[PDB]
């Protein structure tokens, strides 16, 4: 099985959340991941919005497609890890769900 | 973000 | 004030999740809503998929525009209802947050 | 449907709470509520008292009574919602319910 | 210190929640302690509703009294049990607080 | 508070 | 679903 | 109920 | 029914934490109880170590051993309590659980 | 980075808890762990007790030893997963954590 | 720690 | 169970 790990940069352009995604080599991606076995996907949250932001969970429009079959998520919401088996082929859409201290309103990224 | 699946 | 009310009827399709708006009236809507002076919207799910939904927050891209103010929500999941003071004009889109009882994904309706 | 919004402000005298309650022109009421059509009533707090009050519900000693349907609260514990679908006629009282940052007692506005 | 125990026994008459106290003889008694040195009281819920109530706390209308110390709840909801360090004399009033599967109100004991 | 009821 | 603010 | 603390 | 009170203080030692029992005379104890009779036992913690630490629960090899019938826990973690009807004979090893600031790893006394 | 996977089968014996451990080949094994680069570790519950048994965390007696960076849950307790880094050398222990529904005694797997 | 149940 | 970082 492959570990794979993202760093999830938000920043804060025009008073909004701007999702940033770099490797583990510094460089900026858009955070996708092709699983080619059964493994895993860590996302780790680098908040520089000074909203407070934590990972709630990971949200999805298709959520029994059966590509991702579990979601794990840190206490302190810093951390929320995909475990995808790779036994059904396809693709999988998804936003990352985030609370926020400066209002009630939950924060999805980009559709 | 997407996954994509090539099992 | 004005307390508007919709109801969330999700069923599934194709084994994914649709969400069909009903109005007071009974008819399908597009669970738009807008607003003239501040006031409330209530949405009351009515789960049809045998998934064991929840709301568990309302999500939006934009959570700082300032055109929702607040999200409240009952401890059963089965209500959300938004406070719009109506004082900054503009749309916002935003997307339901729902747990399932059948995996660990969370369920967002249509961008 | 009517939205009605009331404010809770919390003071301490003699190390105590009090609640005083505020309309939406600023005049002291008793934060009751007449129910003429199915709306919402919506109660913010304003918590003066440096003991970092927060709702956690709404408590009702007859709660099978049917006067409110539900009730809703935001993840910040500053804004609790009333569902009232003006079906069933007759009166309730309701205490509110917060925790408070001082000790583990719950606090209970007055009977 | 001395540990005392109390059977909180909730029935429905009329359609609405009932306490009735009985201590370590069955008999029904009032619930109220009075404590002589530093100690516990421990609370064991027996709900005959099928309202499905759990105690979620111990509200106090003047909760910064010091009469009681701290409040602890299992995680079942079954038990709630107070600390009383008999430090500060005097007498306080306490409401239990309940939520319920039914509906999204919380019940409370009698004033 | 209270809430009265008159639908 | 959207929100429309219409002041 | 009440509790009275007889200290 | 006996009350019996122990102070957890906690601190650091090469990095890591030392658990050192208190009795109500503030001598240095093994936090063990000998229970002759229904009763309680009151964990009260005093955390020395700059790491957040809140008690989370009590933990058990044995859990369905009968020593003791059940945990209440503070709302703050500050406090947990173990109830012991002293019916079942014998006697249980169990370790207190926290969670931490600086990290989100669980916190266990020693086996 | 590698993606190691474990099943957590946990069946009762005499009335307790058995953890056995199985690889991802069905072989019985220890469940230990060597992590030659950064990864992660994936433990799934199995559990055969009939007690209704969750993850709730993993505890560690070193919490603060680098080893383990860090942990997440799923939503619903079935699952578990560890992250580590491999920046740190050495050696820790840990035990599960789980919940169970016959009583509010935290469950730990072996020291 | 232990407890010691002598009931 | 152990971990056995061997980096």
Redesign the interface.
């Known amino acids: 099985g492959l570990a794979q790990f993202i760093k999830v940069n938000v920043t804060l352009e025009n008073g909004e959340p701007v999702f940033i995604y770099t490797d583990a080599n510094g460089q900026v991606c858009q955070g996708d991941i092709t699983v080619t076995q059964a493994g895993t996907i860590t996302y780790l949250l680098n908040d520089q919005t000074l909203k407070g932001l934590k990972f709630v969970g990971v949200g999805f429009v298709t959520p029994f497609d059966g590509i991702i079959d579990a979601v794990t998520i840190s206490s302190d919401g810093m951390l929320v890890q995909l475990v995808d088996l790779d036994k059904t082929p396809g693709t999988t859409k998804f936003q990352f769900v985030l609370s926020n201290t400066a209002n009630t309103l939950l924060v999805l990224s980009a559709d | 973000?997407?996954?994509?699946?090539?099992?």
Chains 1, 3, 4, 5, 9, 10 share one sequence.
Request: proline content about 29%; aromatic content about 0%; charged content about 15%.
């Open positions: 973000p997407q996954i994509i699946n090539r099992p």
